[PDB]
Design an enzyme around this catalytic site. Structure first.
Site, mmCIF file in Angstrom:
data_model
loop_
_atom_site.group_PDB
_atom_site.id
_atom_site.type_symbol
_atom_site.label_atom_id
_atom_site.label_comp_id
_atom_site.label_asym_id
_atom_site.label_seq_id
_atom_site.Cartn_x
_atom_site.Cartn_y
_atom_site.Cartn_z
ATOM 1 C CD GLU A 1 -2.579 1.418 2.276
ATOM 2 O OE1 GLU A 1 -2.238 1.697 3.566
ATOM 3 O OE2 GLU A 1 -4.262 1.038 2.045
ATOM 4 C CE1 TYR B 1 -6.568 0.312 7.032
ATOM 5 C CE2 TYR B 1 -6.154 0.245 5.034
ATOM 6 C CZ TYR B 1 -5.759 0.826 6.270
ATOM 7 O OH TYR B 1 -4.688 1.210 7.072
ATOM 8 C CG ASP C 1 -2.340 9.459 6.004
ATOM 9 O OD1 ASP C 1 -2.347 8.618 6.945
ATOM 10 O OD2 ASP C 1 -2.980 9.949 5.151
#
Ligand SMILES: Cc1ncc(COP(=O)(O)O)c(/C=N/[C@@H](CO)C(=O)O)c1O
Ligand SMILES: Cc1ncc(COP(=O)(O)O)c(/C=N/[C@@H](CO)C(=O)O)c1O
Ligand SMILES: [Cl-]
Ligand SMILES: [Cl-]
Ligand SMILES: [Cl-]
Ligand SMILES: [Cl-]
Ligand SMILES: [Cl-]
Ligand SMILES: [Cl-]
Ligand SMILES: [Cl-]
Ligand SMILES: [Cl-]
Ligand SMILES: [Cl-]
Ligand SMILES: [Cl-]
Ligand SMILES: [Cl-]
Ligand SMILES: [Cl-]
Ligand SMILES: [Cl-]
Ligand SMILES: [Cl-]
Ligand SMILES: [Cl-]
Ligand SMILES: [Cl-]
Ligand code: NA
Ligand code: NA
Ligand code: NA
Ligand code: NA
Lengths: 395, 255, 395, 255
Positions: free
Chosen positions: B49, B175, B60
């Site tokens: 990834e 995910y 993030d």
């Protein structure tokens, strides 16, 4: 699924990580409920009247229009508690936080006015307030940082990215993603993911509602145009909303032209940027050719949001509202002119709106026109900046 | 191509979980990043990834924020990242390569054109971090038209509606960021979702074995690899050594 | 001969050089005429409403009184244009100037708030404004000096005597003695020679009138007491006037106690000074044993007038009003408390009034009492001073 | 005593105007001030007007403001001024001595007690600068009880009511600050006022002769003497010389 449309034509949406969608859905449901709740509306009205000082004056400015056929009124959001329009919608969002059983507030701020408004509302209503602010902004807004702290808010400097408003925006969303069960994100402008553009408009719309009633009382007709500065879009959509269906009334939004559009050192993404997706929304952005988000440049700290609310982008696209820009020098002249001729010190943000009204007047001085400028804030906060410029010029 | 399908079939035959490291392309520079990625592969990464540095990575945490800053300090651009991707694929024909993107970089020059470039360089999947399933239609459509798997996050606060949507819309893998964990995994299978990779806080071998035991197809290390880069900036050689040691241990745990 | 009584009992009078008596007589006649003139009253009302933002809110402060039987309201003069009560009576005096055919304004200021109010009123109404300010005050009030200048007023530093407010007071009277045919002296407090104590009260009395109507609406009865800081006396007499004949309502004026009355470093002449004759009036003074006039010391720049209005001295002498003092430290605590618990940053002057109300509450927490504090101004101007103190303490 | 009455009778016999200098007591110090005053007398001053330094002389221009500052710098107090007055009178028995006072210094320890002290030291008149005729009753009464003349200013903006009041209330002389000048002077005489001394801007001999020609009994130099002190601070000897030269010339002009 949402209760309300997240888009204004092609603009808007809910471009957040999946983890934040429940928080947005919860907030939308709470808002829709609150809007039908007479008890909520009465509490909001009570705070606006008895704490913030609404209704605000509509001042006729006779000296500055002398010898022309312009009549100019100023809607006096500079007289609201806290010194800017930001106070209106923080009081509404703080009540939504409580409605949802939240005890904590998160807010972003650039110039510090929204941070101060968030801190004062949190202090009054017993919420624990934390404010994210880009480290560069913290450094240049020590007075506002101190007000926020005096009012018991935690001010958290953000060092990531450009250490400015956009980075503070990101940090607030990161926090909220983890904390939304107990914290509300008090977004400070009519932008971001749905439902914020809708909520912020509805909690600022008394600006235009009062303006309409006031101008009808004083002049017996609607304005030819209402004029407001546009950083993210809250004060402008608050003035515009109640006039949208009055098709004769011009809606003019003024973005910062900075050093001049042609220099690229400006903050006018609606007319001179490019549509992108950032901060939860599809809207015109300040961005590089390869899609990195950039800062908005202006003399005025508060016109730093590097995008614009999606309802503005929509109103422009259909031709209902018109958007223009005003440079640093034009805003500074308007600031000086209002101080000297009307005894009102305007925020430099608001000075951009005034500068455009003065241009409308001066360009066509024998045009009969009834204009309202939204004076979004007072300019006490700007006197050092202005002082420093006039010294540098040799004035 | 069918790189994820082939990988999972092979792992299933070996009774083995996938281990998938994340890194930011161009961190701490283009040359070193290429070497890091080859080291991850040589050490036993089953898939990659890969992040493209973005100015405003609002999904993030600090580790990756700092990786982006390092890549920007090196002057890394999306165009350079795509050159890198082509070189990586040219060296490694079967390993699934997934991107983690921000919406503005996908939308910037046209969504369709973005996925066409992905296909040209040999990317297998794209997860757009700030596009929830509710907004995903044009991204999923463009992905599938260009033989790219659209990857979706199933978050800890997922509900049944979301599980059904992710199961329907996603390809390659799901995910998982983790309702009880056993519930989510069984429900995804029930709904014929792409195989689940556990992505929450995967920083030790024990967590890899745990993910597999819970019924997931493997695990994604979202930031542990980047932390090793951060810690070893001054010693490129030691950096590669620690990366190899870490990936080898994480992969061993998938058996 | 005058039209109105120049004295409040033994206090007041017209102790000016003979040359200034015609100016005082002219002003008294103009005022008496104006008070009977519906056109003047309508113009004054229009400016107060549409320019200054009256009526001002009456805010109930729930957090700070929690767990006591005190209900506390704040009369929000901090929300008036200019940021303090000073604006009300400058608008009235500027209209009197025009009524008398004067085109120029003279004003004195200490902290700078009256100077700013005088400058803004002069700018709006097309008067040429000059402001005398002690050189020491000019040096420590650069922000206010700059606002005054932005608004087109001439700020003249006064180097005579102590280079503070009293010296600026003298200089204004010296100028006026020569210029009164064309200039009006816009005195900034309810003190000085008749007719100023009367005019300033009547042009500030809407504070108390609105307070009365607001408290009747909200509580159905009059307050137990109204509390105001006393520098020269304007904001306090403005709050008190409409309640004087309501004998159940306490009238409490709060002078600055500075470092403590016993240190002699204070500004509380009404209770701790001695009657003298200065600045046109017989009133309690800060003065030496041999009769030299001295300065008032306070943390708060605005409580620097070294005497007190004669109507306050009179109301005290007959027992109608009670006067107390609050120290620098007590005022600073009240400042911090209002910021943190109500989200309002009060002027340090006003903080003295709040501190006394907090003492009334805390001393007798099971006493049922309905109090109003006059919040004479906002405290943005004070954040640097407060910042510097908290740093020095180690906070 | 009748010092002004005797002076004016003597001047009238000599067909002569009065010349009256003002100085601030204790400027630039007690010793030098005593010497200055003796120099004014020796040079031909007919009477004196003497200021007591006050913190807030709101009727005075810059020259006198600065004289007060100098006296304060020397530590001069009202008590010291009264000691000075006693010494001046002890040296000079016939010269009329007038004070120019601020109200607070008169009121401070009691109005009656102030005028009693004036009488004890041999002062002849007091002008209270900030007490208009409208407020003068307790001052005039105390003055007259202690054989002190209350002096009033007749200003340039005087009217008939004021002229009548000043004529009725004042004694010693009327302080004229100058309706046409001829009008004021004739009207004061008509109303039997104390003899008028012209006090406005008397800084040259020509102005003394002019005052006398207009029908005034003489002239008061309100600030010219103080200006000479200011200009000669560095040279006490030159100061006295210039003072003597100036007063001699001003007095000569009164003939
Ligand atoms: C007085 C004033 N007028 C206009 C604007 C512009 O904002 P909208 O377009 O009305 O939403 C601002 C903004 N300030 C933000 C950003 O720095 C903030 O304080 O955090 C402002 O402070
Ligand atoms: C915000 C505020 N509250 C109270 C007072 C106190 O004045 P009163 O007693 O109400 O007349 C002042 C005074 N200020 C004067 C003197 O420095 C000035 O500005 O020139 C003030 O600014
Ligand atoms: Cl409830
Ligand atoms: Cl603090
Ligand atoms: Cl309606
Ligand atoms: Cl009308
Ligand atoms: Cl665009
Ligand atoms: Cl491979
Ligand atoms: Cl799209
Ligand atoms: Cl196992
Ligand atoms: Cl008129
Ligand atoms: Cl200026
Ligand atoms: Cl009534
Ligand atoms: Cl009630
Ligand atoms: Cl007293
Ligand atoms: Cl003699
Ligand atoms: Cl008296
Ligand atoms: Cl002659
Ligand atoms: Na006009
Ligand atoms: Na913007
Ligand atoms: Na209570
Ligand atoms: Na005082």
């Amino acid at each position: 699924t949402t209760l309300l449309n997240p888009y204004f034509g092609e603009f808007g949406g809910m471009y957040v990580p999946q983890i934040l969608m429940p928080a947005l859905n919860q907030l939308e449901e709470a808002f829709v409920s609150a809007q039908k709740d007479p008890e909520f509306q009465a509490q909001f009205a009570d705070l606006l009247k008895n704490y913030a000082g609404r209704p605000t004056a509509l001042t006729k400015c006779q000296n500055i229009t002398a010898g022309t056929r312009t009549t100019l009124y100023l809607k006096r959001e500079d007289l609201l508690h806290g010194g800017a329009h930001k106070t209106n919608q923080v009081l509404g969002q703080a009540l939504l936080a409580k409605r949802m059983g939240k005890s904590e507030i998160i807010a972003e701020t650039g110039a510090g006015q929204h941070g101060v408004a968030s801190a004062l509302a949190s202090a009054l209503l017993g919420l624990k307030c934390r404010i994210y602010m880009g480290a560069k902004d913290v450094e240049r807004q020590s007075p506002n940082v101190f007000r926020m702290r005096l009012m018991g808010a935690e001010v958290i400097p953000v060092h990531s990215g450009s250490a400015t408003l956009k980075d503070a925006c990101n940090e607030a969303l990161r926090d909220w993603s983890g904390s939304y069960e107990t914290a509300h994100y008090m977004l400070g402008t009519a932008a971001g993911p749905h439902p914020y553009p809708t909520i912020v408009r509805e909690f600022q719309r008394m600006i235009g509602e009062e303006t309409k009633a006031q101008i009808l009382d004083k002049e017996g007709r609607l304005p030819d145009a209402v004029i407001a500065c546009v950083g993210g879009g809250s004060n402008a959509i608050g003035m515009f909303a109640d006039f949208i269906n009055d098709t004769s009334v011009g809606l003019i939004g003024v973005e910062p032209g900075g050093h001049g559009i042609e220099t690229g050192e400006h903050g006018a993404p609606l007319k001179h940027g490019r549509v992108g997706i950032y901060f939860g929304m599809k809207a015109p952005m300040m961005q590089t050719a390869d899609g990195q988000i950039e800062e908005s440049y202006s003399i005025s700290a508060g016109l730093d949001f590097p995008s614009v609310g999606p309802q503005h982008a929509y109103l422009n696209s259909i031709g209902r509202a018109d958007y223009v820009s005003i440079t640093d020098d034009e805003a500074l002249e308007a600031f000086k002119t209002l101080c000297r001729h009307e005894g009102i010190i305007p925020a430099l943000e608001s000075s951009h709106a005034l500068a455009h009204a003065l241009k409308m007047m001066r360009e066509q001085p024998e045009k009969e026109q009834l204009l309202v400028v939204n004076l979004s804030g007072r300019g006490d906060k700007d006197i050092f900046t202005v002082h420093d410029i006039l010294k540098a010029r040799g004035e | 191509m069918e790189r994820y399908e082939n990988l999972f079939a092979q792992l299933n035959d070996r009774r083995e979980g996938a281990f998938v490291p994340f890194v930011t392309l161009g961190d701490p520079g283009i040359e070193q990043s290429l070497k890091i990625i080859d080291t991850l592969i040589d050490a036993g990464a089953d898939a990659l990834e890969l992040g493209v540095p973005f100015s405003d990575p609002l999904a993030d945490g600090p580790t990756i924020q700092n990786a982006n800053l390092r890549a920007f300090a090196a002057g890394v651009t999306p165009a350079q990242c795509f050159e890198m991707l082509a070189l990586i694929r040219e060296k490694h024909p079967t390993i699934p390569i997934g991107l983690l993107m921000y919406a503005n970089l996908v939308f910037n020059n046209g969504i369709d054109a973005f996925y066409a470039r992905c296909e040209q360089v040999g990317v297998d999947s794209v997860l757009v971090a700030d596009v929830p399933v509710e907004e995903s239609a044009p991204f999923r459509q463009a992905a599938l038209r260009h033989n790219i798997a659209p990857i979706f996050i199933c978050p800890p606060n997922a509900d049944d509606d979301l599980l059904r949507q992710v199961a329907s819309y996603g390809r390659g893998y799901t995910y998982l960021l983790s309702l009880p964990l056993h519930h989510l995994i069984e429900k995804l299978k029930e709904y014929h979702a792409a195989p689940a990779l556990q992505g929450f806080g995967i920083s030790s071998p024990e967590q890899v074995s745990a993910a597999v035991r819970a019924g997931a197809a493997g695990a994604i290390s979202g930031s542990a690899i980047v932390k090793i880069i951060e810690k070893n900036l001054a010693s490129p050689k030691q950096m590669l050594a620690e990366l190899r040691s870490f990936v080898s241990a994480m992969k061993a745990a998938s058996r």
